[PDB]
Structures are given as structure tokens and as C-alpha cells.
Design a protein around this nucleic acid. Structure first.
Ligand SMILES: [Mg+2]
Ligand SMILES: [Mg+2]
Ligand SMILES: [Mg+2]
Lengths: 80, 119, 178, 48, 136, 94
RNA sequence: CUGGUGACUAUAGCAAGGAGGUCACACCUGUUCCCAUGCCGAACACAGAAGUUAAGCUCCUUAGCGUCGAUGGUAGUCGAACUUACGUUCCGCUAGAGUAGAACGUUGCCAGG
RNA sequence: CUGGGGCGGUCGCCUCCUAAAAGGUAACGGAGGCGCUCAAAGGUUCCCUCAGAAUGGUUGGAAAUCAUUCAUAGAGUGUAA
RNA sequence: UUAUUGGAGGUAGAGCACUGUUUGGACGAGGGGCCCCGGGUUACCGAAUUCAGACAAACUCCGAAUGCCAAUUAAUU
């Protein structure tokens, strides 16, 4: 890599706040918050609202039930 | 699927283009350098007669030793020059073989110059 | 090297068992990742290309190579040699880090994410992914970005066929639409 | 090139060479190193 | 009226007419065909006249193949002009036919019908002709 | 399936013209088990034989003393004259 | 036999099938240094050797394609005689196309086995 | 100059065809260009290979930039051939 | 001058590998009149491809006869 032409890039810990999942990957993001790692080093921490672990599609969790059929809704609504 | 190029074929094309303007006469024989991942080979050649006057290589037992490839290259260059001196060859035209004139290839060339072969 | 470690151990084992590869060398691998942003708007305004370059530089962590038009097209008001795009080629550690982030963080951040298309293969075991916005990538900030812009991510694999490529990406944990 | 140019040696002032240039492309007086016979050495020659 | 849609050169040297036919001397698409025994230019008009005559007799039950195409343009000077001052304007399009050339091919009819149809065509054409069949 | 033939020497243009007028057809014999031989065959006899054997039918050729089974590899025909100008015979390995 | 480097119009190529790896050649492993990327150690360069014949590569088989290619005949044509015929005749030369066939190279020098 | 003259057209140079496989060869024969341009679009050294098509991919449409494969040149070569 | 040998060159003829011209077959990349994001089928099939057959002063994968240029070349003049 040419010197001085590339943005500063450093190992940072990406944390999923929802599921408390921590992984270390390179980024040009700088975080004031820094967290310890399994290895004897401390890296800046990037907090993620959602991640592969948390995201519904990845998990396959169904947040909402499927829409009822027209026959089903009719019977349920009027109790018939 | 991405194809991987054969490095020797690419350099050979480059060699052929160099060879158009470069040939070895008996008076001024061509010094060909072939460079592999592990070894460097040098031959002094007379193109008119299509004959090789002298040879030196890292794979040769005398030259073979534990050294960096550039260090070996210097040894090959010194060896070929001494052999050329025995055959009365003082003037040669350097054939880079299509390889860049840097590092190992250069070291062999420089060594031969220092030994007394005139480029 | 979390993604690389998985590839070296877990992924290699899965692929060689699946396709009965005689040699480890046969096992498919991702040669490179190229991120391409086409900016025809740059023709109208040079700044638009400059903003894109910065975004790509932040996303990939390496300076992009500006792409100049091969030919002039009147409809696009394009002149040959004009800068209309930027590209980055990611290789080695940088590639794995970007790919792991894409699957782990950037792809989740995609709005209304329903998985990536399974049909996005050239037929030669090479996969191209299109991102609607660069806001999905974690580094990019919404305040900083004046205009939301999409990107093309091309993942080049040594795999001869798409099916082998699909397995490699699935082993990496790439989401698929199915 | 739209105009004829005469290059004069800076040292001796000799108009050793004549050349052509595009005035719009090269508005300034062009300068280049040229062999000067009187000096018998290469010298800067500038358009008059 | 058969004619080339475009040509690189509208004014061309007139074709050599001496010699024998280079190609198309065998019936290849039909059961029967008309063979030229003499040399002449064949105009687009002549082809059409011969074609219309043969199709009418055949009643369109059979299929007609026109082997010759009028590729070459020919020029004519404006009337009452002196010589020189350039070549004239294109007047027509012609095919050079030499002895042996099959002008037309017919199929989907009995020989008797074909012989009459080709006879009717022959009378519209400058060259002398002979009725011919596929040879094996 | 048998037709007699006669061998030929070096021929001038006039000779071949006289041969075709006589009704004989110039021909050559080549293939497996035979060196190239230039031969002449009567047109009428050839036509009768080929009708019997067909276009690709094997024919017995009386090439001098020897008899060689041959096939018509190719033939040259004059459409205007309705005459076969030349015949190529290919020897068939048996 | 292998490799380097030359000669030759592809009969030498392409494609398809198969085989091969102490050495050699690669792929490969890294980027500390020389050196490098209009971004990228991809390449180039260099330092190496954990792994691998997968590929390249080398070898073998083949005639599908490409290439080569007769003999015979034909077109054309020099000359001559005859003619004015979209000609004829004789003599010499003699294609193109196509056909049989050839062909999955042949070799020089140097260093290893 | 001129298939009489006038009128019209033309006049130097370059490329092709006519031109009859050396060269040369005419008509008011058939076609086109030139009266420049470039300070690199010159020199040298090193490095590199196209057009097009198919497929995958967002702004992006037949066609922009990206990727793979095929592609022997159908590209390019300042400007006619 | 002829014989012998070597060479330059692209005409006649021929051919369609290129650039154009062209006839008859099949055949479709991809949707419209047509029958379902849930499939079909009686234009165009224009892209393209393929088989067969023709054309060219300014087309050429080819390619003569002659003519031309030569030869420490022989015969005759
Ligand atoms: Mg000439
Ligand atoms: Mg001539
Ligand atoms: Mg001709």
C-alpha cells in the first residue's frame, strides 16, 4: 500500500448492544469508547443496534404472525 | 472463476520483443538469463551459429549454497564471467530474458561486469 | 482473521467433503472484491464524484481509483476521458475484514432486508451484489452524506460454477433470499 | 501549429534554429536546449 | 422489379459477356429449370415478365425459384447530347447470363406443366433456352 | 457391375477431344491398393452399369489385366452437352 | 529423459480424453528489506518453503475443426492457323475448387538425469 | 482546355480504380482528399493489448462505470485512400 | 535471340475467408394479438445462427499463361 494515500485504518470492536455480540474487524471509524478483547489488547468499540445475530431474517424469528385468511377472519370476528 | 496467468509465457513474449534488436555474434555473444522461483541460469550464446559457449547456474553444485537468491545471483554472474574469460570472451550483449533489470537479474549482470565481461 | 480462520478450517472442510475435491488447491476461494460506484451525475457536477470518492474511501479504507469514460455518448452527455466513477479493489486481510463487516453489520443495516438474491451469479462462480444506499455501511454517517447513493460489490471467486460459489458464500454466512 | 518561430541562443543571441508553435497552445515565448555551433555546446535557445 | 437495395458504386464498367457460365449450371432447388444456351444481359423487367408468365400457367400450385439477380447497374446518357462530359445516369439493372446458366427453377408441378410454363417464360427472354431437369 | 476400361498415355488437348467425340470418357483410378492409373471408359456402358449399381454402388473395373472393385468418388459433367467429361474412381479396401 | 536457448510456411495449431511431481518447473507462504500499485504485494520486486499436483506445464491417444495436399480432369492463357463467330482448331503452359492422401511436428547447441 | 465556339465545368498537389500480375500509360472516365496539425500527437527507456458479444450488478435506460468468459483483430493508427 | 536458373508483382480464371450485393430453405434472444407476482404458443421473429445457391473495375482464402528484372550461365547472332 502506498504511504499517505490511504485513510487511517485500525482494528475496532463491533458490539451488538441488543445481543451483546463482540467481534473485531478493521475499520476507519474512531471510537472514544474502548473495550478489552480476548487477546491482551484494547480496541475502540463501535455499537450496533442490529447485527447478523440480532437481525430477524438471519435468526428466522417471526416478529409478527401471518395475516389471517378471509374465511378465518370472518369466522373469528363474528364467532361463527 | 478468474484465470491465473503463466508468468513464464508472459516474460517469453517480452523476451521475443527484446530479441528483435538483440542477438549474439561470435565477437559479441548474447548472455541469456533465465530466472525461476528458486534458481537463476546464465548461458553465453552465439546466435549466428546457434551454439552456447558457456553456462553457469545456481542449481550447479559448485554455485549451489545456502544464500539469498540475489546473493546466489551474484555468484552465478561471477562464475559465468570466469568461464567466458577461459573461452576468450570479453565482449557480450546482456539478454535480460524479458525479466525486469532489477534485483536478481541485475546482480548477475553486475557481477559479470565486475569479473571483467564488458557490457 | 475470523472470516479467514473459518475459511481455512470450517469452510474448506465443508467444501471438500461436498464436492469430493481430490486436492486442497481445488477448494474454491474468493480472489478479490471490487466496489464500483457509477456517478453519471459527476458530468453535471464534479463535486458529486468527489463526495462519492470520500464515501468509498471510508467504506473500504483505501483510496478509490477514479474511472474515466471509455467512449462519448450524447444521450448521457458523456465525453471520453471524463471521470464518471470510482472503484476500489480489496485483497488479502482488507477483503476478509470488509466481507465479514458486510454480512455482520452492513447487510443487517439494509432497510427492509429480506436476504440477498441467489440468482446474482454470472454463471462462472462470480457474484455481484448491489447496495441501494451507502448509509447501510457503518462508517458512513447520515449527516455527513449529502446524497444517498448505491454501490456495486463484485465478489470474484476461484469457483468454476455458481453452485460451488453459493456454498462458499453460505459457509461465510452470507444471507440468501432463497 | 499556426506560427513560425525563430529560436535565438541566450548566450550569443544567434538565431540558430527556426520552428513552429501554436500561439494559443503556447502563448509564452518557447525555450528549449539546442546545440549552438559558435559555442560548440548545447545552450538554452529562446523564441525571439 | 428485382434490384440491389444499395451499391457501393452506381456507375460501373459493363460486364464481360464472352465466355461460359461460372456457376448455377445445375438445378439445385427445383425438379426442373430453364437453361440458357446463349449469352445476353437480362434486365429486371425481363425477369418479371418471364416470372409472371410462368406463375400464371403454374397457377401458383408450384414454387418458382429465380436463380439470376440483376446486380449490375447500367447507365444511359440523356437524349440528344454530345459525347463526353461524364458518364450518364443509372437507367437499369442487369444480370449477365452465359450459356449453361439456369435462369429459373420450378417444382410442385408435373413435367408437362413445367415444360409449358418455362416455354412461356422463354419467349419473354432475349437468350435462347432449353428445358432442363435435376441430374443424378 | 463390371465394365472394361483401357489405359491411357500422356494426352494432348486434341486427343481428349477425340476421345469424348468417340464416346469414351477419360477417368482416373485411385484409392487403397492401387497406384493412380489414367483410364478410358465408354460413356454408354458406364451409364448402364451405374444405373444397375446406383450412384454409390461398387463396380468391378477391368483395369488392364487386373480387375479392381471401384466406386465413383466424383464425376465432371457438361450440362449443355449432356455428357460426362471425367470420372474419378476410388478403390475400396476389402 | 528433462530443462535452457535457437531453426523451420501450423504436416508443428485448436479441441477432447487420459497420465505425471524426491530433483525441476509452478501453484504457494509472507512483505522485513530492494522494488511496486493512476486503488490493490493482483501484477511487479524481494525474502522464503507450510502445503499441493488442483491449474499452468510436460507426456500419451485422437483427424472433429484448422493446416498441408496430389494424380486425373476443367477454366484461363503464350504462340500458330482459321475466322468475325458472345468464335473454331492445334501446340505449349496450366490453375482455383474439389478428391485420394499427409498430419496430434521435425531438429541445432549447452547443462543436468 | 473544350467531341466547333460561347455558356457551364476545370487548371497545383495527394490516394485509389480504369492500368491489360515490373514500371509507365489517356478521355470534360469512376471515387475521394490537401493548401494542415501536434511542444507531444517528437526522441528514448520500461510497461501494456483491442473492437464486439454473452452473463451478473444501483442510481443506469440498447448503450456510462464494475466483474468474469468468449473474442485474431472486425479496434486503434491526428487528417482522404 | 533462345535455353537454363532465381526473383519481384495480384491480372485472366476462380473463390466467397474480408467489404459490399443476393435467392430459397430451415431456425430462433425475446416480448407483443393470444391463451398465466400465479403460464403460454398458427405475425413480427426484425438480433443472431445454420444449410444450400449466386454476384463485384475500385472484394480476395487463392491464382496462372505471358510479360518484366537478373545470372564470373551456354548456343546462335
Ligand atoms: Mg502496373
Ligand atoms: Mg502489365
Ligand atoms: Mg473475373
Amino acid at each position: 500500500m502506498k504511504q499517505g494515500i490511504h485513510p487511517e485504518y485500525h482494528q475496532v470492536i463491533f458490539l451488538d448492544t441488543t445481543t451483546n455480540f463482540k467481534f473485531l474487524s478493521g475499520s476507519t471509524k474512531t471510537s472514544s469508547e474502548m473495550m478489552e478483547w480476548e487477546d491482551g489488547k484494547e480496541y475502540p468499540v463501535i455499537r450496533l443496534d442490529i447485527s447478523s445475530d440480532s437481525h430477524p431474517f438471519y435468526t428466522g424469528r417471526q416478529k409478527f404472525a401471518a395475516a389471517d385468511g378471509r374465511v378465518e377472519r370472518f369466522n373469528k370476528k363474528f364467532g361463527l | 472463476m478468474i484465470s491465473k496467468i503463466d508468468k513464464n509465457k508472459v516474460r517469453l513474449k517480452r523476451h521475443a520483443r527484446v530479441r528483435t534488436n538483440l542477438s549474439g555474434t561470435a565477437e559479441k555473444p548474447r548472455l541469456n538469463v533465465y530466472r525461476s522461483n528458486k534458481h537463476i541460469y546464465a548461458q553465453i550464446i552465439d546466435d549466428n551459429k546457434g551454439v552456447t559457449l558457456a553456462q553457469a547456474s545456481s542449481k550447479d553444485s559448485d554455485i549451489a549454497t545456502t544464500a539469498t537468491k540475489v546473493e546466489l545471483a551474484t555468484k552465478v554472474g561471477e562464475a559465468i564471467a570466469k568461464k567466458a574469460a577461459d573461452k576468450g570472451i570479453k565482449e557480450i550483449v546482456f539478454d535480460r530474458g524479458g525479466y525486469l533489470y532489477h534485483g536478481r537479474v541485475k546482480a548477475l549482470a553486475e557481477a559479470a561486469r565486475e569479473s571483467g565481461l564488458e557490457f | 482473521n475470523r472470516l479467514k480462520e473459518k475459511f481455512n478450517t470450517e469452510v474448506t472442510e465443508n467444501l471438500m467433503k461436498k464436492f469430493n475435491y481430490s486436492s486442497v488447491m481445488e477448494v474454491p476461494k474468493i480472489d478479490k472484491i471490487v466496489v464500483n460506484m457509477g456517478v453519471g451525475d459527476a458530468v453535471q457536477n464534479s463535486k458529486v464524484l468527489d463526495n462519492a470518492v470520500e464515501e468509498l474511501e471510508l467504506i473500504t479504507g483505501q483510496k478509490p481509483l477514479v474511472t474515466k469514460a471509455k467512449k462519448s455518448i450524447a444521450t448521457f452527455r458523456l465525453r471520453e476521458g471524463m471521470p464518471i466513477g470510482a472503484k476500489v479493489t480489496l485483497r488479502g486481510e482488507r477483503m476478509y475484514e470488509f466481507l465479514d463487516k458486510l454480512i455482520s453489520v452492513s447487510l443487517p443495516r439494509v432497510r427492509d432486508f429480506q436476504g440477498v438474491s441467489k440468482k446474482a451469479f454470472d454463471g462462472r462462480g462470480n457474484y455481484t451484489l448491489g447496495v441501494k444506499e451507502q448509509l447501510i455501511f457503518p462508517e458512513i454517517d447520515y449527516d455527513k452524506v449529502s446524497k444517498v447513493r448505491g454501490m456495486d460489490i463484485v465478489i470474484v471467486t476461484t469457483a468454476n460454477t455458481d453452485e460451488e460459489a453459493r456454498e462458499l458464500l453460505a459457509n461465510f454466512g452470507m444471507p440468501f433470499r432463497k | 501549429m499556426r506560427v513560425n518561430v525563430t529560436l535565438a541562443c541566450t548566450e550569443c543571441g544567434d538565431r540558430n534554429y527556426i520552428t513552429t508553435k501554436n500561439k494559443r497552445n503556447n502563448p509564452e515565448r518557447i525555450e528549449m536546449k539546442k546545440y549552438c555551433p559558435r559555442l560548440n555546446k548545447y545552450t538554452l535557445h529562446r523564441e525571439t | 422489379m428485382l434490384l440491389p437495395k444499395r451499391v457501393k458504386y452506381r456507375r460501373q464498367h459493363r460486364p464481360k459477356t464472352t465466355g461460359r457460365s461460372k456457376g448455377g449450371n445445375y438445378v439445385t432447388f427445383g425438379e426442373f429449370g430453364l437453361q440458357a444456351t446463349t449469352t445476353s444481359w437480362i434486365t429486371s423487367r425481363q425477369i418479371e415478365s418471364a416470372r409472371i408468365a410462368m406463375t400464371r400457367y403454374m397457377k401458383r400450385g408450384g414454387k418458382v425459384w429465380i436463380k439470376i439477380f440483376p446486380h449490375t447497374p447500367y447507365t444511359k446518357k440523356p437524349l440528344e447530347v454530345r459525347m463526353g462530359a461524364g458518364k450518364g445516369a443509372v437507367e437499369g439493372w442487369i444480370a449477365v447470363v452465359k450459356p449453361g446458366r439456369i435462369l429459373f427453377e420450378v417444382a410442385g408441378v408435373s413435367e408437362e406443366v413445367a415444360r409449358e410454363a418455362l416455354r412461356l417464360a422463354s419467349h419473354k427472354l432475349p437468350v435462347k433456352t432449353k428445358f432442363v431437369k435435376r441430374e443424378e | 457391375s463390371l465394365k472394361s476400361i483401357i489405359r491411357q498415355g500422356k494426352q494432348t488437348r486434341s486427343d481428349l477431344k477425340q476421345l469424348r467425340k468417340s464416346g469414351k470418357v477419360p477417368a482416373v483410378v485411385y484409392g487403397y491398393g492401387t497406384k493412380n492409373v489414367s483410364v478410358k471408359v465408354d460413356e454408354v456402358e458406364f451409364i448402364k452399369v451405374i444405373r444397375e449399381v446406383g450412384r454409390n454402388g461398387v463396380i468391378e473395373l477391368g483395369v488392364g489385366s487386373k480387375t479392381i472393385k471401384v466406386m465413383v468418388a466424383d464425376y465432371q459433367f457438361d450440362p449443355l452437352k449432356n455428357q460426362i467429361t471425367h470420372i474419378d474412381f476410388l478403390a475400396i479396401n476389402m
